[PDB]
Amino acid sequence: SMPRFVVQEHHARRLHWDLRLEMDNVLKSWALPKGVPEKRGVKRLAIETEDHDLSYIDFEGRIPEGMYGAGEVKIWDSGEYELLERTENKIKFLAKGRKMNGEYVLIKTKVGWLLMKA
Ligand SMILES: [Zn+2]
Numbered sequence: 001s002m003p004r005f006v007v008q009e010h011h012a013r014r015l016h017w018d019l020r021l022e023m024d025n026v027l028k029s030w031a032l033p034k035g036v037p038e039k040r041g042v043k044r045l046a047i048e049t050e051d052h053d054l055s056y057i058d059f060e061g062r063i064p065e066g067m068y069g070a071g072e073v074k075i076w077d078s079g080e081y082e083l084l085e086r087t088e089n090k091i092k093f094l095a096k097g098r099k100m101n102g103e104y105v106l107i108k109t110k111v112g113w114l115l116m117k118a
Pocket of ligand 1: 010
């Protein structure tokens with residue numbers, strides 16, 4: 001297998017959360033400066049970032065200083081997910097995490113991305 005996701009909490013110069021989905025055989029990734037929306041209605045900024053390799057999904061530890069992405073990475077949540085809709089501008093999925101669960105949607109507009117919870 002079932003596709004999985006991870007939300008990493010990243011203590012970098014700006015403390016943020018990275019949402020990564022196993023998708024297109026890579027980790028499709030977004031930085032969430034204010035984290036995952038925890039209830040319906042909440043609209044959180046999602047910043048599209050570079051694909052990561054699948055093996056990074058279980059990573060925890062310190063990215064060293066002077067490297068792009070420096071800081072401590074921990075797993076904030078993780079689980080399988082079921083993809084429900086996908087186009088170049090919308091990704092809707094059922095998350096099976098311990099914190100992030102139920103349906104969520106990533107949307108792309110001319111100003112970037114947003115993450116919302118059903
Ligand atoms: Zn990060």
